[PDB]
Amino acid sequence: QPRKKRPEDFKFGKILGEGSFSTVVLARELATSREYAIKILEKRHIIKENKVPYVTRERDVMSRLDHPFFVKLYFTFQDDEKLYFGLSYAKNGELLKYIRKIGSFDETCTRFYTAEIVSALEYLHGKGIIHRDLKPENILLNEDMHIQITDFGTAKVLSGTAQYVSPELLTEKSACKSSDLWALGCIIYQLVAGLPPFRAGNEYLIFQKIIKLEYDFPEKFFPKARDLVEKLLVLDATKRLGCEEMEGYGPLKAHPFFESVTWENLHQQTPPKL
Numbered sequence: 001q002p003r004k005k006r007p008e009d010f011k012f013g014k015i016l017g018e019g020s021f022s023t024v025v026l027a028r029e030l031a032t033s034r035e036y037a038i039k040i041l042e043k044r045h046i047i048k049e050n051k052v053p054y055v056t057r058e059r060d061v062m063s064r065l066d067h068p069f070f071v072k073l074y075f076t077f078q079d080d081e082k083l084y085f086g087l088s089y090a091k092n093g094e095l096l097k098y099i100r101k102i103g104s105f106d107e108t109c110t111r112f113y114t115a116e117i118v119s120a121l122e123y124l125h126g127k128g129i130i131h132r133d134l135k136p137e138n139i140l141l142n143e144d145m146h147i148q149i150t151d152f153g154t155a156k157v158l159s160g161t162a163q164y165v166s167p168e169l170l171t172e173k174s175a176c177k178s179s180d181l182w183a184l185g186c187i188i189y190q191l192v193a194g195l196p197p198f199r200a201g202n203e204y205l206i207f208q209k210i211i212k213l214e215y216d217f218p219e220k221f222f223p224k225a226r227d228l229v230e231k232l233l234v235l236d237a238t239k240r241l242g243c244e245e246m247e248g249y250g251p252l253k254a255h256p257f258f259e260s261v262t263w264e265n266l267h268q269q270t271p272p273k274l
């Protein structure tokens with residue numbers, strides 16, 4: 001393995017993402033001219049805020065993932081004050097930005113991007129890993145406009161954001177592969193409608209709607225997409241299409257909404273123009 005890298009090995013540029021506990025900055029490695037999204041964490045802050053388990057979890061999950069639809073962790077290093085994680089740079093930023101920019105996706109684009117998300121979850125779940133906070137904000141787009149999923153601090157390894165929270169969190173404080181499938185249902189809805197299905201004035205009211213399954217479809221909603229969303233946004237987590245009790249990804253990928261999809265080499269296909 002190559003030597004440990006250090007801050008002086010890079011020219012840092014613009015901020016790519018910001019949170020309460022870390023910041024992601026674009027960096028060019030001087031020796032190679034390669035660009036990375038370097039996530040920078042202050043050790044003292046992470047300790048004082050008791051976030052060590054989330055940082056450790058992200059580092060451990062993002063190392064293990066070897067699939068084109070995920071941001072990869074390439075290296076780590078530290079100085080006196082900070083931890084640095086070298087991540088895949090997804091040049092086109094968040095899926096959320098595209099939804100805001102174009103309003104809502106047509107059916108060809110909805111189908112393609114939903115298929116990539118499904119294929120990514122199939123990989124992740126096949127490794128016994130659940131994301132637990134999947135959303136358009138952490139589904140990134142690379143230079144070629146394929147997805148790259150990131151932000152793995154909340155991931156669970158098998159022995160979140162209000163709008164996408166599954167009912168089992170609100171009623172049981174629990175989560176399973178099926179929680180990611182609920183998030184998928186919300187995301188498909190948001191691609192088609194242009195807005196998340198559970199919306200309200202404040203977090204409390206959103207939670208109220210989720211536990212009552214209080215949402216509805218706009219008239220312009222692709223009917224096959226509507227049927228799919230209805231088979232994902234189900235209160236009983238064991239009855240969501242894609243979950244183990246529903247016999248997994250086979251029946252999900254076979255849904256009529258995906259009729260024209262070739263599943264085998266999505267990463268090799270040219271995405272539809274947005």
Ligand SMILES: C[C@@H]1CC[C@H](C(=O)Nc2ccccc2)CN1c1cc(-c2ccc3c(N)[nH]nc3c2)nc(N)n1
Nearest residue numbers: 016017018019024037054088089090150151152153154
């Ligand atoms: C800072 C940001 C928001 C907060 C989140 C958090 O703190 N979550 C959390 C907090 C507490 C506990 C658990 C989880 C961590 N976030 C990110 C951002 C990116 C990222 C962004 C842009 C990129 C680009 N253009 N190419 N690559 C990129 C990679 N990658 C990871 N892994 N995490």
